[PDB]
């Protein structure tokens, strides 16, 4: 293989700029040239395509974001869009792809990846929920950009004597709920994988106020439902000066962590190295803190786990 | 005098621990006695009054928040709720009070003044609103926690080619969205002191889409509605894929600038000061960069100005 | 088992604030009372021993540094003090410790236990120089702070197009240098465990400026030698505009990233459970991603390892 | 005037990239073409210059050191390499400059003025040293990046008990170390423009761990010395765990503050007015919160004051 393509698509995560940069410094390490392809799948069919030098990924490693930009396609999927697809492709002789982005994205590349075009999946998201690794590209950032805001609710909830709702992005997993609930000491986290006792919570709050806590957080995942609601619900039962913050967007900028840099620019090489290496279809990640790849229609089937042992920790710390 | 008291009330703003540890070290400096009276004017009234010793501010400068809480009095209001906090105040033989917080606050001051107790008002607050200063205790940190969230939501918004809008506090005041839009280069800026149109608004928006501004951000003090209705009114009139976030009460907390944990420094010494030299019924505050102190009565009259000389360059810098 | 002591030695790192925390309110979930012991091992000396209540680690979880504060003991190591060590311990019934900190602490640890004192060992240094564990806790804190310093060295060395060469903390270990370099771009990283040559690193270097790279970052471990030695050697075989600068400790202060709180957190329980279960001369930590503990005679022995396949990396994507 | 150009020079400073940015937009905004001159002076004579467009500038607001880059020219002070600037500068019709950086800077300046081509200097430095302006721009997030590292070194000082001495920037000023000392509540601040004394800085030492103080932070402008000199001097006469360190070139690098982004599209766009109005040879900044402007060699005469009364505060603050 001499020409290769790289893009990213789903939702941006810090750390794309980095995996980019690997993918492109690991393949011109290796004699290969590499294609930018800009905005997810939907520049296979506009055919914004670019070569992209060394000079290219200079300046970008710090950098949130994505500077390929990303875009939903739902023409892709279409056979007419996809072979629109192909033809840009072929056209500019590219072999083999590195996608770089969420679980929507891994199955546009196997897709490709049957139709002759080799392509490797690198798990960028902030939601951690990418079967196939411990840990996806984006989401040590989005817990420091949690736990930061967190530290400073907790300066106005302590002052004030007050009760807070804090919701947390993560789709439909609870990692960032779960982990950065752990890590603000949250009198209770609110996760899909675990059940929750709204009375239980309650009365955790009641028995803390009672022993003199004045102030509490709550933190809730998006996919468990609305902080506004679990509020009210909450001012009702107490009658106690509740506030909800959403923390929205913010969780998915911001020049990503050193954690997320190494994860990056450790699986965008591995990804070169594969498609280089006759293999297709396949993802990387991080399990076990070891590096792995595997088939990815054999783990798009496997559910996502968060580490239980880690919620019991979280209630016994609570109390 | 021998012997003061010094309490924060209104909503806390980081940089009230600095202040506080100011008012202490400095009074201690000139061998006069200081309590912390807790839970802002509600202190007066339970008595939940202590002894502050120099320890008590020795780890402090840099934490967000009020170690000595803070808490609306409605009671205090009452002549009835005045005199218990009279009466703790001679109970304890407090000859003065230094009051750290917003505007709502500077009422309890003078009324205590006109009764025998000497009070300084000084400014704590991130709304920037409270006449006599240039600045408040606690904006200049507010400022900088917006702008690190705009600057990741600027990650996003580019990545994906979204504009949005964004909800940033300030009571009834600009000064947070003004200065905080200025910084972070916002497209517009929409402020109570100002006039805005906002089809001038979409205008500007369209206009920058066709030549090729792929994204915007838009600020919205929240003293002027709602992000979430701008918005859809937004995406109404363009069709074009706006998202909202309404950043919260994050702007209150955190850690302390440099510009406020010295601006709090100086003003909190200042008015100990004043305190210990026969003058009552003062605020501090800076202008012109200078330290100045004004009788409270004469300036709670006056209405609080944004330069629009700031706003006008605004305008001039997003076309 | 129902009371236990806990204390910090070593260098102090940041997440041991978190770990004590743990350690206390993971002792109380199950009925165990616990003593912060002061200053290290010259707290079992000179007897500076607290009960530690709920209360006591409220307001921690995100603090840097050790609230139990640390120090060395060179006393304690003869068998006089330790017997004073001793004898202070079972004056107040304390029948196990958890040690947070070096690996300097874990042979006090394993001292008590020989003496019917079953001590477990918990994992505090930034250097992430410690056997038995992948991972020690405030390393990732130790990266960001890096990565935080090299990313404003980075805006001043491209504005001026000079060369940089930064010396990182680590002690004997290249770990922090390791993963900063790489998650910083450096063009060159040395560290004590892999060979450089300081003749191909000025000759990476030139055929860097040749193409057009104004600007460089090398990266030194403080175990390979001085950065002031580096630059010079550097400013002689180039004459070209070489900086030094010397991070020093700041490395190992500030609230700790979302990593070392939660490793905090569940190393901190971990090991509570351990002694709680009639376990001692044990140390815990997290290898291949799960929570292990070991005989830590068995495992001072072990010599320690960066990840090799993590260093060509950096040789690959710097080039 | 329908041409200008802008130029950065001297050291690089946070906050230059929005002063470019607001020169360019307003010129923009005014029918005037901007070009960028690299490298500084160097730039007029390598003839590196390029007409800036708005999307130049579309990215620039939060980022640290200058787009434009800057360097050193000796050749342009020789009467030589000045002529062959002048004939860039016809060359492309280039009718008159904005000069953003140092006090080096605004010589070149004066020069060009009376050699028919006006010049409007700005203030961009970190050191906050420049004459007709109460700040410059990079000053605050100066502060704002020591303030940090002081706090991180509060936290190890703090935990181990030890005493450090923390060297600043500022070159021949005092103003970093003294807004940055008081910010951080130091024990003592060297800087030039106010007398020290060793041994009364030795005796408040002793007169602190006396009363229980276990630490200290003591801070040196580099502009007084050497802080590995101040640390071993005080090493011998207290004969106590003395730590120092220097912040270095961090303080020049980063993402600027609001307030450098705010002050430099301030005075950026009011740079460009005065140029726009037949003024030359003058220099802009913010004196007593107001915009003004000054006959560059009236005001190189003029010498820099810190204001004392701030040095007392930190004076009677410490104790």
């Given at each position: 293989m001499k020409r290769i393509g790289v893009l990213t698509s789903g939702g941006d995560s810090p750390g794309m700029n980095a995996a980019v940069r690997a993918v492109v410094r690991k393949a011109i390490y290796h004699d290969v040239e590499v294609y930018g392809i800009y905005n997810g799948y939907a520049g296979l069919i506009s055919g914004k395509i670019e070569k992209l030098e060394l000079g290219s990924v200079?300046?970008?490693?710090?950098?949130?974001?994505?500077?390929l930009y990303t875009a939903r396609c739902?023409?892709?999927?279409?056979v007419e869009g996809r072979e629109k697809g192909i033809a840009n492709l072929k056209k500019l002789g590219i072999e083999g792809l590195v996608v770089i982005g969420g679980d929507g994205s891994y199955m546009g590349a196997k897709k490709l990846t049957e139709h002759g075009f080799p392509c490797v999946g690198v798990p960028g998201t902030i939601?951690?929920?990418?079967?196939?690794?411990?840990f996806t590209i984006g989401f040590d950032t989005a817990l420091n950009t949690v736990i930061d805001a967190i530290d400073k609710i907790r300066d106005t909830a302590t002052s004030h004597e007050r009760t807070y709702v804090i919701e947390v992005m993560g789709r439909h997993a609870g990692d960032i709920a779960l982990w950065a609930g752990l890590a603000g000491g949250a009198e209770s986290i609110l996760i899909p994988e675990a059940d929750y006792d709204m009375h239980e919570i309650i009365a955790r709050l009641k028995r803390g106020h009672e022993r003199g806590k004045k102030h509490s957080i709550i933190i809730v995942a998006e996919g468990v439902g609305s902080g506004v609601e679990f509020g009210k619900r909450i001012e009702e039962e107490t009658n106690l000066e509740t506030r909800v913050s959403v923390?929205?967007?913010?969780?998915?900028?911001g020049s990503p962590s050193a954690a997320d840099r190494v994860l990056a620019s450790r699986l965008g090489a591995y990804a070169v190295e594969l498609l280089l290496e006759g293999k297709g279809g396949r993802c990387v990640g991080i399990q076990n803190n070891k590096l792995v790849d595997h088939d990815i229609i054999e783990i798009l089937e496997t559910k996502h786990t968060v580490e239980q042992n880690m919620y019991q920790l979280s209630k016994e710390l609570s109390i």
């Open positions: 200079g300046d970008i490693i710090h950098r949130g974001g994505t500077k739902p023409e892709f999927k279409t939601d951690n929920d990418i079967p196939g690794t411990d923390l929205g967007h913010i969780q998915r900028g």
